[PDB]
Amino acid sequence: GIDPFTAPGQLECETAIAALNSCLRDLDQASLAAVSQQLAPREGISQEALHTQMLTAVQEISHLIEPLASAARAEASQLGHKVSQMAQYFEPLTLAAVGAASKTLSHPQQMALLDQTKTLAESALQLLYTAKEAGGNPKQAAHTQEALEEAVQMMTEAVEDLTTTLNEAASAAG
């Protein structure tokens, strides 16, 4: 949580990066454990509720992704607020995805949303990474301007992607 740049948000992004990085490892180990029956069935949720929890989070993530993109490039004092929101939704997503991983023995939908959550988490990680650089400061982030764009679009891509598996998982995993 250090500011090597010159703005608010640099802190929030790096602190969230630490948390988001942790969920990446959790998800990555989930896919490894679930593929070897080394994972326990969810944390504390049912099958259709997974579709509920994950989808509800993803939507609100995407909801904040756009305002965060705007914030990361300029809104320094606002960026931190977006980061707080983005990071918090990814936690249940991780939990829920790891849940679906070990719990869903229906179809590849299990591994699909497990991986997609991780993909979206990596998308958000790349997002928080670029947001930490550019946060409120377009100057020391000239090339970061480009990557911040790739990241924001990377999220919305994985957003639709995970959402597909989740929404179908109603009958595809239920």
Measure the N-to-C terminal CA separation of the chain; round to a whole number of Å.
41
Q: What CATH number is associated with residue 59?
A: 1.20.1420.10
- 21: domain range? 1-174
CA distance 7 to 5: 6
Burial class (CB in 10 A: 0-12, 13-18, 19+), 111: middle
The pair of three-digit structure tokens given for residue 128, joined into one six-digit string: 């928080």
Burial class (CB in 10 A: 0-12, 13-18, 19+), 155: buried
How many domains does the chain contain in total?
1
CA distances from 123 to 25, 41, 115, 116, 149 (A): 14, 26, 12, 10, 11
Elucidation method: NMR
Exposed e or buried b for every residue in 68-85, given b needs 16+ CB within 10 A? bbebbbebbebbbbbbeb
CA distances from 134 to 8, 71, 93, 146, 147 (A): 11, 9, 26, 10, 10
Burial class (CB in 10 A: 0-12, 13-18, 19+), 65: buried
